Design a protein around this ligand. Structure first.
Ligand SMILES: [Cu+2]
Ligand SMILES: [Cu+2]
Ligand SMILES: [Zn+2]
Ligand SMILES: [Zn+2]
Lengths: 153, 153
């Protein structure tokens, strides 16, 4: 798996398409695409553990966290494998996503293929909210849109 | 990955949920669940190559076929890794799926996690339709509903 893709959908008007590319095995992973229907500003953005959409986005479960760490920001050291921090929405509620990250992988046992990607109601506080919940979801809030991450051409 | 799941959706009224379980590494894989909104009778049922739903189900691409074989039935020897043959709809258009298969896998390089599952308009003819198209799609027809296959709890 060099490439992947994911279509985000939800009950909301929120929706988008996000691509992944890992040119090198165990190298970094460019993540990019575009989401629309967001409130202007920051929104949390994570890979969650399961490709389950049985019961909407709640089925996805908690943040993908195979090394059992506390939640954090993507550049933080103590973080969930799935913690990609935030994405930023336009005036117009379009967020033009573009991220490199080398904690996640499309191969290996950090492989995120088959897991749900989720964009959230509010900003991820990157674990620095000082409340119980911040070291788990980053207080990112409810799950506005999501989709399973799949192997792309 | 012991278990997986996939939610089938489409433009049609067709929809359902399908589960997967592979108790042994490289063993067989129980596939079961239920789909509704079908025309009574047989309907083709395959894993296609890609977890792409960019442009509905067409983005999924051709049948998952990593050994470059000709299309067949699931118990046939010459078959696509993704050829699970058919599923059967009620009077009421509910199909109660239940299948063992050991060509597909949730691990290894027949891993189908991250690929689209698709249920089709007509019956898969298992390659025996004698026409060009029958050794590719089994003449199964258009793509009524589909979804990416993801890692389940
Ligand atoms: Cu999250
Ligand atoms: Cu097909
Ligand atoms: Zn997290
Ligand atoms: Zn086939």
């Amino acid at each position: 798996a060099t490439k992947a893709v994911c279509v985000l959908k939800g009950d909301g008007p929120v929706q988008g398409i996000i691509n992944f590319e890992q040119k090198e095995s165990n190298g970094p992973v460019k993540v990019w695409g575009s989401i629309k229907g967001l409130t202007e500003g920051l929104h949390g953005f994570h890979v969650h553990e399961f490709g389950d959409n049985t019961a909407g986005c709640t089925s996805a479960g908690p943040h993908f966290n195979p090394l059992s760490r506390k939640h954090g920001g993507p550049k933080d050291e103590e973080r969930h494998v799935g913690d990609l921090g935030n994405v930023t929405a336009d005036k117009d509620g379009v967020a033009d996503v573009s991220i490199e990250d080398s904690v996640i992988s499309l191969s290996g046992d950090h492989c995120i293929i088959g897991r749900t990607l989720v964009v959230h109601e509010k900003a991820d506080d990157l674990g620095k909210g000082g409340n119980e919940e911040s070291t788990k979801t980053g207080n990112a809030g409810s799950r506005l849109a999501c989709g399973v991450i799949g192997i792309a051409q």
